[PDB]
Amino acid sequence: VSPREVGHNIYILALQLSRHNKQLQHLLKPVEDPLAYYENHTSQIEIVRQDRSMEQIVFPVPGICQFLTEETKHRLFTTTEQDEQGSKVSDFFDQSSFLHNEMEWQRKLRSMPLIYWFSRRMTLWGSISFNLAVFINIIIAFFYPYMSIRPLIVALILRSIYYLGIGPTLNILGALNLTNKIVFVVSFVGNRGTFIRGYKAMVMDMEFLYHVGYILTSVLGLFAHELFYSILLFDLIYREETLFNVIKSVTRNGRSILLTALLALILVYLFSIVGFLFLKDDFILEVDRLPDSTERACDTLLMCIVTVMNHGLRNGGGVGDILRKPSKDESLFPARVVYDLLFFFIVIIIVLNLIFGVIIDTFADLRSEKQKKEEILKTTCFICGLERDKFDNKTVSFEEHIKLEHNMWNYLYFIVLVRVKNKTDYTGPESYVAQMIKNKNLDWFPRMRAMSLVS
C-alpha cells in the first residue's frame, strides 16, 4: 500500500462530493502542491450506459500513460479518418492497442540512455545525410570525370578537395554518409518501434524498405560506382511535404493519365495505318550518319508507327512538321492538308491537353479535400462530433468541452486503465466499459450529445 494512492482515491471522492458543496470546490482548487499533483494526474470522461443515460467518470491516470509521444498524438489526431456515419471513434479505438504497445516501448527505451539519445536526433541524422548527399552530387556533377554551419562545411570541403583531392574527398564524404545513414536507421527503428508489431510488419513498412534502399544505394555509390549517388537526390521528395503533394497531384489519377496515353497511342496507330496506306512516299526523314542523307520511315507499319509516335507527339505542329513538304499542284495536297490538320487537332490540341486537364482537376480535388478535412478537424469535436455553434452562449465553451469533458486522450487513458486493471477490482462503469470492449460495442462513446449542453 502506498499513501499516494490512498490520497488520490480520497481526492477523487472529494471531487465527486464537491459537485454538491461549494466550500469543497473552493478548497480543492490548487493555490509541491498535493492538489496540483492530484489535478495533473486526475482525468474525467463521459460515457453512455445501456439506458442511454450519460455518466461522468473520474479516474486516476495510469503511470504508463505518461510515455505517449507528442508526435504519435499529433499523427493520430491529424490522420484519423471518418467512417460512413461520420465518426472517428472506430479508428481511434482500433489504434488503442498500438498506442499501448508504443507506451510500453517508450518506457523500455527511456531506460537505455545511449539508444534514447541516438533516437532523439533522428532529424539531425536525416539533415546530415541529405546535406552529405547534396554535396556529393554537386561535386560529382562539377568534377566528373576526374583524373549557419553550412558555409563552414563548404569551406572544409573546398579545403579537402584542394589538399587531398577529389577522389579522397568523395571517399570521406561517402563513408560519412554511410555511417550517418546507419545511425539514422538505428534511430528510426528505436524510435518508431516498428519491430513491436513484428518482423513481418517491419518488413511490410514502406518507410523501412525506403531507408534500406537508401542504404543500399549509398553502399553502391561508395564501392561500385559513384554515379549511384544521384539516386539519393530523390530523398528531396521524402523530405519535403509540399513537393510530395505536388507529385500526388499527378499520382492520384495516374490510371486516368495512363488511359489517356493509351488513347493517344491508339490514335497514333490509326494515323500511321492511314499514312502507310496513302502517304507512304511522304515519310522522308533526314539522318546524320556517323563516319545518302535521307531515309524512308514508312516502309513498314511498325516503323511508321514509331516515326509518328516519336515525332508527331514531340512536334508542336504534329506529324505534318516532319513530312515532305507538298506542292499545291499535287493531287494529294488537300488530302495532306486534311491529314495534318486532323492530327494536330485530334492528338495535340485535345488528347495531349487531357493529361494536363486531369492534373489540374486533381489539383483542385486535393485542395478541396484538404480544406474540408481541416475545417472538420478544427470546428468539430473529435469524440462527440458536435460543432462549435452548439456551444454558443453556454456556460461551458467549445474549447473547454474539448479540453476537459470529451478529451480523446482521456478516453485512451480510460481504455488503458481498463486493460491494466484486474477484473476483480473493477467498479460498475469500469465493468460496463470492459464488457462493451469485449463485445466490440462502441455505444458507450457519446455521440452528438454533451452533458454540459443538456444540463
Binding mask 381-420 for ligand ATP (x = CB under 6 A): xxx------------------xx--xxxx-----------
CA dist 328 and 321 (Å) reads 17
Q: Which three cell numbers, joined as nine digits, stand for 409? A: 486522450
User: Which residues within the stretch 344-403 sit at the binding site for its own copies (CB under 8 A)?
Assistant: 344, 349-350, 352-361, 363-365, 367
Within 224-299, residue ranges assigned H as helices are 235-239, 241-251, 254-278
Binding of Zn ion at residue 384 (CB under 5 A)? Answer: yes
Q: CB of 351 within 8 A of CB of 313?
A: no
Return d(Cα 218, Cα 181) in angstroms, integer.
9
- Piece of 43-51, 54-62, 300-308, 398-406 that binds ligand PCW (CB under 6 A): 300-308
* DSSP-assigned letters across all residues of 211-241: HHHHHHHHHHHHHT-GGGGGGGGGHHHHH-H
The answer on whether 401 is annotated among ligand-binding residues is yes
Of residues 121-180, those binding ligand PCW (CB under 6 A): 127, 130, 134, 137-138, 141
Q: Which residue in 157, 196, 215, 306 binds its own copies (CB under 8 A)?
A: 306
Taking alpha carbons only, the member of 411, 417, 408 closest to residue 74 is 408
Residue 315 partner contact from ligand ATP, its own copies, ligand PCW, none using kind-dependent CB cut-offs of 5 to 8 Å: its own copies
Q: With H, G, I as helix, E, B as strand and everything else as coil, classify residue 48.
A: strand
Q: Residue 245, annotated ligand binder?
A: no
Q: Should residue 283 be labelled a site residue for ligand PCW when binding is judged by CB under 6 A?
A: no
- Do 419 and 100 contact (CB within 8 A), yes or no? yes
Nearest to residue 272, comparing CAs of 304, 315, 299, 294?
304
Binding mask 192-231 for its own copies (x = CB under 8 A): -----------------------------------x--x-
Residue 172 contact among Zn ion, ligand PCW, its own copies, none, beta carbon within 5 to 8 Å by kind: none
Residues 413-452 that bind Ca ion (CB under 5 A): 424
C-alpha cell recorded at residue 237: 521528395
Dist. CA 127–CA 145, nearest whole Å: 28
Q: Pick the piece of the chain touching ligand ATP (CB under 6 A) from 58-66, 142-150, 348-356, 380-388.
A: 380-388
Chain positions 217 to 256 lying near ligand PCW, rule: CB under 6 A, are: 217, 225, 227-228, 230-238, 241, 244, 247-248, 250-252, 254-255
What is the 3-class SS of 344-400, one letter each residue?
A: HHHHHHHHHHHHHHHHHHHHHHHHHHHHHHHHHHHHECCCCCCEHHHHCCCCCCHHH
120 CB-near residues (< 8 Å, 6+ apart): 187
Beta bridge partners of 44: 58
Q: Which of 10, 154, 302, 377 contacts its own copies by CB under 8 A?
A: 302
200, exposed or middle or buried, with CB in 10 Å at 0-12, 13-18, 19+? exposed
Q: What, of ligand PCW, ligand ATP, its own copies, none, does residue 381 touch, CB below 5 to 8 Å by kind? A: ligand ATP
Number of H helices, E strands in the chain: 22, 4
Start-end of H helices in 279-332:
301-307
Residues of each annotated binding site for ATP? 70, 73, 381-382, 403, 406-408
Question: Can you give the binding site for ligand ATP, defined by CB under 6 A?
Answer: 77, 381-383, 402-403, 406-409
Question: Can you give the binding site for ligand PCW, defined by CB under 6 A?
Answer: 127, 130, 134, 137-138, 141, 206-207, 209-210, 213-214, 217, 225, 227-228, 230-238, 241, 244, 247-248, 250-252, 254-255, 257-259, 261-262, 265-266, 269-270, 273-274, 277, 300, 302-303, 305-306, 328, 333-334, 337-338, 341-342, 345-346, 349-351, 355
Question: Can you give the binding site for Ca ion, defined by CB under 5 A?
Answer: 424
Question: Can you give the binding site for Zn ion, defined by CB under 5 A?
Answer: 381, 383-384, 406
